[PDB]
Design a protein around this ligand. Structure first.
Ligand SMILES: CC(=O)N[C@@H]1[C@@H](O)[C@H](O[C@@H]2O[C@H](CO)[C@H](O)[C@H](O[C@]3(C(=O)O)C[C@H](O)[C@@H](NC(C)=O)[C@H]([C@H](O)[C@H](O)CO)O3)[C@H]2O)[C@@H](CO)O[C@H]1O
Ligand SMILES: *[C@@H]1O[C@H](CO)[C@@H](O)[C@H](O)[C@H]1NC(C)=O
Ligand SMILES: *[C@@H]1O[C@H](CO)[C@@H](O)[C@H](O)[C@H]1NC(C)=O
Ligand SMILES: *[C@@H]1O[C@H](CO)[C@@H](O)[C@H](O)[C@H]1NC(C)=O
Ligand SMILES: *[C@@H]1O[C@H](CO)[C@@H](O)[C@H](O)[C@H]1NC(C)=O
Ligand SMILES: *[C@@H]1O[C@H](CO)[C@@H](O)[C@H](O)[C@H]1NC(C)=O
Ligand SMILES: *[C@@H]1O[C@H](CO)[C@@H](O)[C@H](O)[C@H]1NC(C)=O
Lengths: 172, 325, 330, 173, 326, 173
């Protein structure tokens, strides 16, 4: 993928995460699970929704094709009307199809970017208290509670609190 | 051994694909189809208004008063017109309806017409108005008949045909669509028989229109058993305008005329049925009942329709690329 | 307590917004409006040349020489034409000017005209030239008169209207726009009185053109007190071409005509009642002057000169700076 | 924001930095202030300016609408003219409107990219000689006079020079 | 110590593309999409040669100007080339009515067969052979007429009787035919050529009516003629029937064409040579695989789209930043 | 460059890397050289070709102008015909020209991001077992085998195996 997270350094998606586009998976002595980041998922939904209605609103005008009759001394204006109506047809067909190909390309990268920025956000919180694996997963250098896991997702993670304990096992 | 937190993204059972500039056939978790490719094959009321089914009559047959079209004879209101393609009742007595394409365009820009007697037969003095019938224009009941909107005026059993005169002063607020003709006999004998001798003219004028025509006698190929011809004409009397008519023969007088009321007009040539359904978007090949922005069905339609385009599919990815495990 | 370095970005007092595919009403620090909505409700000289103001005359009234249009009568140079919506002085003797839409088109394109006597009255022999007047076409100063570029020719007291002939050879470098007509009496009575009895015709030819009309006698609705009609006609006599005129009756003859100069402009005729002033403009729309550097224009599709591309839009503001997030004070 | 810097992990903007789009805020014993990074705001200005110019150039034709009259036997060609003119006006309105929505989205992305890159640049220099607070701010584990600050901004920071100080300061805390 | 580095490709390329942000940008790889080069001659399309009307205009060809005999007979063409300086057209002065519509209808064809529609014996009691003019010389004859028309004149002693003909189309193919109406300059000429009194020309079919009478007057001399002829054309539909009737001034159909139905008519100077094209513009042959062309919007066959651009180059590779060497 | 790698924090391209767009330069006691990353080069090639093809197909209709003539009474329809044909000509030239400028901007971005992403893939593997020189280069704190180079490339670098050799050197310094 283009930011490199999706079909990239995070090799696959999660059939398990049902409530959001972008999310967290955690494992600890108490269990394992999936949880969506409500903020960025909702941020994206509003984004995409806006894009889709922007496109629909702009495609709102239609061209009138008329099918008036032409006599047999009117071959030139009959032909002119046909080339005219087919010219506008060709332009709108091109507009619509091209807009869809480009927009699909950009919507995919948006999702890739948002995932990447989620990973950085956590990485930025944890620092040396955790080992960052290739695949977007962090291994804690300390025992992480459900409170601690939840503080990571909330963005309220207390780094100094675990720094010592992490230093030790990092040394073991 | 350590606890782990992972960043990742949604997957699902989707097999719906999209296309991007860079790649084809990309399965995406969520998408939206913007293009409608389906239709009900029938014609339906639009603004809670039924269309005019011409049935076995062409537009020519209907507004001239072709005797086999009596069903359409009175007042009319429409949301669009349906002319059936193989309709057989049109111009019955062979001739040319001048500025036909233009007439067809004027009719479709309308929404309603009221029929009324513009010129009573009594208008023209010293001339017969009861003998103007032909075996080329037969109603279902009788072999010899004429358009209901015109009078074929003809010489009294006593010669001759004198100058005849008529005027109409449009006092209403609506434009008036009317018609008339000029007979073109195959022979000088038919000429003499039906009208006098001498040079014949049909002259018509309003405040903005001038008309003058004379008989052009010759024998054309037989059409409906007729080697004669009639040149048909149409015009429009504006609110506030007067019509003067004068002739000493060869004139098909206007008998009946239409008050004309004028949005987007449609004349649909098709064979689809007209059913009791209602609708908001009608195309010549059927009804669209759909929320989608784009349609591939037809460029020709009346009502609020999605834009027509030649594409088979316009799907926008909303969701991320779908890769599951 | 320690030494800080921070990375950030500009902000400001800007309250100007833009839309983007993903989000509406974004405030940005810097932007540029590409569309112009402002205009001056007036007509200004184009390429330093004043437009023609037809005042109370129509285009027909002007080039036929309606007697009340004498303020315009003569030579005119223009960069475009303005016709007032409620002009009173057009065609004053009732009738059709044939191919009128195509005449308006030709005139527009359409730079200057030099008036001149194409057929002097002596051209027509044995007929009367002094009686061609009607109460339909008063001048401001006489109750009865007639168009300045035409002659209405009537039979002399002897009740024979002779065949009359006219020739004009264009031995010049410019086309000549000219007019003539065919009178249509409400009567044979009037017909016999005005013109000789018996079949009548107006024929006219040039190297590439032919024309033949005969009168269409009929009583028609009264207009300007006239039940008769005149059928007006127009042609263009190309350089090196010759006109031959031949009538036996009912000819309204060409008298004066126009050397016509065609333009390198595009040409415009504006139907409008906006004022006309001593001012120069690069762009003239039908609803006003534009004086702008902008790329797109709200105001009109119809213009002469250099104008921004017309568009429906309310506004086309382009972001150039970044999202504006100034710090909150209280 | 798409690169996540602007109104992202850098929460707000500086009304005080007035000489450029992207910049450094510094604080030290010698004092504090705002300095716009000049190389990258300059490239941004060049690019945005070219973008604006390109759009103005490609939009510099005009479809011609004409004032011609039509008689009432010319309903069909007059309608043909009207639909022809409306047809192009609709096409151009669409092009101009969509273009601005799209470019506006991308130009805001570009700015987000330069902020993020400027921050990525500084971070890779400082390494563990500094402490990451949030909001794009770094706290030094050593003394950093003006000479040192310019050196970060200039791209020439000397990590080895201050490594021992920074490492000892860290242990101490 | 051991190094590993990330980097990208560079090459000796000097081709530049433009960009919304940046103007003159050198890239490693790129594809030009526009063709600006043309062959400059007329060729065969679908292995069907064009028709070269040479010294004749469309009017001269199809009416049969006596000097146009080179083109007489059946013709099959892929497109038509009219030379801009062609001097052989309407020789006897007059108007060919609905000319533009006729030029458009012939342009829509690929083949005509010439055949005798009305044998001269059709018209009884008139002189069919006496009627040529010095306005229509052939190359060998000073006084001739169009090969598709018969200028019919009254027989040695007057008078000109009513004359009548019919043709029944019968066939699959449409018929294109022509006629005229003579307009003498004088009563005197009208009297000499035709009987005295009111004259008429009349023609009709199931769908069409014609009627005209002579407009007698002296027009400015054109090839020695102050008289005129009105020319006319029409198309007899398959199964339709034509009736012709006149007592004077008829310039009659003689030969007509069975016509077979996008085509083009190029007004140009270019030589027609022995070659094939799949794409032919009015200013040359395109032999390309490119998507756009700047040569011409007027063409036939399969051609790339026409745009007014000088170049459309499209970057495939990355920005080229080769290391410097002195 | 927008992701900042090309003509950015990696200042130059390698004329010596001829088998790919994006790559690795290694130097080791067993030799040195330039080696293209095949997977990301190939994907870039598929993408870019698809784009060129897609544009080619979307441009695959033509608007046809005509040879028709017009009388001196047909000036209004003659002009209608010209404005129409010039109108579609302007629309398609705009589309072509605008499309190319926009797609060139984005094809170069795409290349920039593939390089940047290759750079991140290696930096996250190496951590503090290597030192960041500038310009997209990393110097190992430990002896690196040809096999070690291959592990860093193909994505299977063994960090713990070298962490102690690396640390003894890192600050044995
Ligand atoms: C039914 C009815 O009441 N209408 C007509 C009535 O119009 C007509 O009278 C004409 O009345 C007008 C004003 O309405 C003028 O007074 C006409 O006189 C003139 C004119 O137009 O000025 C006099 C002029 O000298 C004449 N010009 C020449 C050169 O001949 C013209 C000209 O002859 C006429 O325009 C030709 O139609 O007329 C006046 O005739 C009367 C007359 O028959 O009939 C009523 O029934
Ligand atoms: C955020 O994290 C804290 C623990 O730090 C937790 O107690 C709290 O409920 C969380 N808030 C939300 C909204 O989940
Ligand atoms: C996929 O999901 C939808 C809703 O979960 C469900 O209705 C459908 O059955 C599923 N598809 C399969 C595998 O049948
Ligand atoms: C026609 O009727 C209107 C009635 O309002 C009247 O004013 C007018 O004079 C009449 N016109 C004619 C020509 O009869
Ligand atoms: C923009 O925002 C204002 C309020 O912020 C609102 O009034 C308007 O509807 C929005 N839409 C426009 C005009 O962009
Ligand atoms: C018109 O004048 C030209 C130039 O003198 C002359 O050659 C031509 O014969 C004249 N035409 C007529 C009809 O007199
Ligand atoms: C990848 O790296 C491992 C370790 O270097 C090596 O054994 C392997 O051969 C390399 N990749 C392959 C198998 O292509």
């Amino acid at each position: 993928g283009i930011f490199g997270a999706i079909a990239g350094f995070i090799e696959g998606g999660w059939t398990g995460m049902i409530d959001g586009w972008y999310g967290y998976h955690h494992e600890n002595s108490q269990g394992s699970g999936y949880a969506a980041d409500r903020e960025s998922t909702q941020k994206a939904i509003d984004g995409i929704t806006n894009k889709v209605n922007s496109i629909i609103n702009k495609m709102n005008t239609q061209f009138e094709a008329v099918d008036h009759e032409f006599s047999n001394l009117e071959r030139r204006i009959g032909n002119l009307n046909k080339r005219m109506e087919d010219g506008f047809l060709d332009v709108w067909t091109y507009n619509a199809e091209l807009l869809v190909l480009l927009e699909n390309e950009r919507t995919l990268d948006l999702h890739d970017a948002n995932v990447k920025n989620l990973y950085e956000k956590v990485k930025s919180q944890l620092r040396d208290n955790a080992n960052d694996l290739g695949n977007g997963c962090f291994e804690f250098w300390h025992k992480c509670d459900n409170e601690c896991m939840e503080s990571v997702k909330n963005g309220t993670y207390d780094y100094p609190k675990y720094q010592k304990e992490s230093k030790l096992n990092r040394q073991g | 051994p350590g606890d782990k937190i992972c960043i990742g993204y949604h997957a699902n059972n989707s097999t719906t694909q999209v296309d991007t500039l860079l790649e084809k056939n990309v399965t995406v978790t969520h998408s939206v189809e913007l293009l409608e490719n389906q239709k009900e094959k029938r014609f339906c009321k639009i603004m809670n208004k039924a269309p005019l089914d011409l049935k076995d009559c062409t537009i020519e047959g209907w507004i001239l008063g072709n005797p086999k079209c009596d069903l359409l004879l009175g007042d009319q209101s429409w949301s669009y017109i349906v002319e059936r393609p193989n309709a057989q009742n049109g111009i019955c007595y062979p001739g040319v309806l001048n500025e036909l394409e233009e007439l067809k365009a004027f009719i479709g820009s309308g929404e309603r017409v009221e029929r009324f007697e513009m010129f009573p037969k009594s208008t023209w003095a010293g001339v017969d108005t009861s003998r103007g019938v032909t075996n080329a224009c037969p109603s279902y009941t009788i072999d010899s008949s004429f358009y209901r909107n015109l009078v074929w005026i003809v010489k009294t059993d006593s010669a001759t045909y004198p100058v005849i005169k008529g005027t109409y002063n449009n006092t209403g607020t609506q434009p008036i669509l009317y018609f008339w003709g000029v007979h073109h006999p195959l022979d000088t004998t038919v000429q003499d028989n039906l009208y006098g001798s001498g040079d014949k003219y049909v002259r018509m004028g309003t405040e903005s229109m001038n008309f003058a025509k004379s008989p052009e006698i010759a024998a054309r190929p037989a059409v409906n058993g007729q080697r004669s011809r009639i040149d048909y004409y149409w015009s429009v009397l504006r609110p506030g305008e007067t019509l003067n008519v004068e002739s000493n023969g060869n004139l098909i007088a206007p008998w009946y005329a239409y008050k004309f009321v004028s949005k987007k007009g449609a004349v649909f040539k098709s064979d689809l049925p007209i059913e009791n359904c209602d609708a908001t978007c009608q195309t010549i090949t059927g009804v669209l009942r759909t929320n989608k922005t784009f349609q591939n069905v037809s460029p020709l339609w009346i009502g609020e329709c999605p834009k027509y385009v030649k594409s088979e599919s316009l799907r926008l990815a909303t969701g991320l690329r779908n890769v599951p495990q």
